[PDB]
Structure formats: structure tokens, C-alpha cells
């Protein structure tokens, strides 16, 4: 527990202790009022007065305790802010230094390099899979003759009611720009 | 237990001891009244008088004990205030010194610096994610052709009943101020 | 009690606004944590493929 | 609350877009892992048949 958190806890406790003290005065002021009534009925006017003074003294003590409780709470609410924004400020100071380290050892130039390399190596691994796929295609060339695939596609297209010819092979802005390149 | 808290406890106890003494006198004054009655019925007028004197002496003792109890309570209520506002004052003196330390080692100039750095480093980490996102976008450029995304968006818009064209690309105060800058 | 009520009405708004600010920060440190991990994984991939 | 709502609306879109990018990468590292294994198996076959 931080040294301010110890103070915060003590202030919050003191605010409650005062609030309890005010409630206890309300309880006892109600009790003394009952004793005035009894003393008046018995004609004990000296005792009636003693209880009257108690009742008025606890009525007013309550208000004092209640007002101090309010003040100590307001303070505690403000020390709470300091405790919280302390923690937030220290966390953000931590973030700033750990990001400062990482942005040194991986600067944007080094990231640019890494990204370009990443992309170029995946271009390679695409050239590689292409030539594996063409090695398998030619190795198994007798197992899948072209004409049998073309005829099966046409048969399945006929059953699907699709007019697209499967034996035969199967935008404008690109063509416009192409013409421009040649025309200049 | 603080040296004042020891005194507070002793005063609170003494107030109760006096209040109990007053109740005990009320109990015994009621008892002596019963003995007067019996002594009068038996014609024992000397004994009747002895009990009468007891009854009147305990009636008046009660009032004294009750009044002192009230005074000792009032004192105890005020020593209570001193105990509480002692604790509050020491807590607030603690707060003042722990905040004085923290505001030295993290002054507003040092905070200003930290905040500016924090912001500048997050501007960097946004430039960084941008260029990672553009590296992935170009590396996977053949998996998401533009025209297939545009056509799917249009298809989903047609089913939603939305007239917004998805092939095509998709305030005044800014434009007014822009014109002003050029006009001067 | 009136003064207490008005003081807690306004304290609430302050706490609520600071909460919002600290959240926004946390959301942004979250991005840094995630894109750190992603960048280190992709640096690893690049060297093992190399 | 309005500022929170608009800030989380837009954070969501950012997280969602980064998620999409990291997935695309992962899909491509998956290809490398698989075609690594395939290439090593086929290199093994070639030498045991040799």
C-alpha cells in the first residue's frame, strides 16, 4: 500500500467515523426527547430541563459532525483523484519508455526493409509452388488426358443446362490505355 | 491507543458510570417509597420518617448524578472532536508532503515533455501499421482482385435495395476558408 | 445534504470523463501490444523462410 | 457517452481491418508451412527411389 493510499484510507475512515458520530447523536437526541416527556408528566421540572439541554446539545452536535464528515469526504475524494492519476501517469511514463526502446531497435527503415523482404520471399515461394504443380501435372499427364476432362465438363454442363462450350477456351479501360501508349 | 484516546475512553466511561448511578438512585427511591407505605400502615412513624428521608435524598442524588453525567458527556463529545480532527490534520499533512515530493520529481514541464513524446510515438506506430497493411495488401493482391470486390458489394447492395453505386468512388466551412486563403 | 448532492453529481462527471480518457489510452496501448507481436512474428517468418 | 460511442464505433473498424490483414498473412504462412512439408516429403521420395 502506497504512502498516499495509507492517507486515503485514513481519511475515508475518518469521514465514516464522523458520519457514525452524527447518527449516534440523532439516536440519542430522540431518546432524550422521550425522557423530557416522562419528566414533565411527573412534574420533575429540573430533570425535564436537564434532558432538554441534552436534546438541544445533541441536535447541534449532530450537525457539526455531519458537516465535518462532508468536508473530510470532499478531501478524500480529491486525494483519490491524486492516487488514480498518479498511477495513470506512471503507467503512461512506462509506456513511453518501452515504446521508445522498441522504436529504436525496429525503426521505420528497418521495418520497410523487413516488409519488402517478406513480400519478395512470398513471390519466390509462389514461383516454387508453380513449378511443383507443373512437375506433378506433367508426371501424371497420362492419367488425365485433356479430351476426357473436356468431355466430362461438357457432359456436366449439359446436365446443368449451361450453354458454355467446354472444349473451346474461355478491362476496356486497360485496352484504351494500351492504345494510348502505342499512339504517342 | 493514543494518549488522548485513552483520556477519551476514560471520560466516556465516567459519563456512563454516572448515568448508571442516577438510574440506581431512581430504582432505590422507588423502593424506599414502598417502605414508607408499609411503615405508615403499621403506625411505625419513626421508620416511616427514616424511609422518607432516604427517598428524598435519592431523588436529589439522582438529579445530581444525571447533571454531572451530562457535563462529562459534553466534554467527551468535545475531546472526540479533537481526536478526529487530529487524525484528519495529520493525514492532510501527510498528503501535502507526499504530493510535494511527486510534484518535484514529475513537474509540469517534465509532464509536458512526456505527453508530447507519447503522442509523437503513437504517430510513429500509425505510420508503421499503415506500411504493414500496405505490404500485406500488395503481397496478397491476386487473391482479392478489385473487380470481384466491387461486383460483390454491388450484388449485396442490390439485395439490400440500396441505390449507391459500388464500382464508382464514394465541409462547406472548410471550402469557404480555403477560398479566403487564396483570395488574399 | 444539498451541497453533498451537488458535489457528487459533479464528481461523477469528472470520474466518468477521466475513465473515458484512460480507456482511450488503454485502447491505443492495446494496439501497440498486438502490432508488436505481429511484427515480431513476421520478422520470424522472414528469417526462417530466408 | 456520445464521444465514447463514436470512439468505439471507429476502434471496431480498425481492429476489424487489422484482423483481416493478420489473417491474410497467416493464410500465406500456412501455405509455406504446407508446401515446406510437401517439398521435404518429395525430396525424401526422390532419394529413396534413387
UniProtKB/Swiss-Prot annotation, chains A, B:
Segments carrying motif MIT-interacting motif: 171-181
Chief place of localization: cytoplasm
Effect of residue 177 to A: Abolishes interaction with SPAST and VPS4A
Membrane topology: Peripheral membrane protein
Keywords for this protein: Cell cycle, Cell division, Coiled coil, Cytoplasm, Endosome, Membrane, Protein transport, Transport
Region (Interaction with IST1): 132-156
GO molecular function terms noted in the UniProt entry: identical protein binding; MIT domain binding; protein domain specific binding
Entry's localization field: Cytoplasm, Cytosol; Endosome; Late endosome membrane
Region (Interaction with VPS4A, MITD1 and STAMBP): 171-181
InterPro entries with a match to the protein in the record: Snf7_fam
Region (Interaction with VPS4B) location: 171-184
Tissue: Widely expressed. Expressed in pancreas, kidney, skeletal muscle, liver, lung, placenta and brain.
Coiled coil: 26-48, 171-184
Residue span of region Interaction with VTA1: 171-184
GO biological process: autophagosome maturation; autophagy; cell division; endosome transport via multivesicular body sorting pathway; ESCRT III complex disassembly; establishment of protein localization; late endosome to lysosome transport; late endosome to vacuole transport
Physiological role: Probable peripherally associated component of the endosomal sorting required for transport complex III (ESCRT-III) which is involved in multivesicular bodies (MVBs) formation and sorting of endosomal cargo proteins into MVBs. MVBs contain intraluminal vesicles (ILVs) that are generated by invagination and scission from the limiting membrane of the endosome and mostly are delivered to lysosomes enabling degradation of membrane proteins, such as stimulated growth factor receptors, lysosomal enzymes and lipids.
Subunit structure: Probable peripherally associated component of the endosomal sorting required for transport complex III (ESCRT-III). ESCRT-III components are thought to multimerize to form a flat lattice on the perimeter membrane of the endosome. Several assembly forms of ESCRT-III may exist that interact and act sequentially. Interacts with CHMP1A. Interacts with VTA1; the interaction probably involves the open conformation of CHMP1B. Interacts with CHMP2A. Interacts with VPS4A; the interaction is direct. Interacts with VPS4B; the interaction is direct.
Similarity remark: Belongs to the SNF7 family.
Name the record gives this protein: Charged multivesicular body protein 1b
Species the sequence originates in: Homo sapiens (Human)
Gene responsible for this protein: CHMP1B
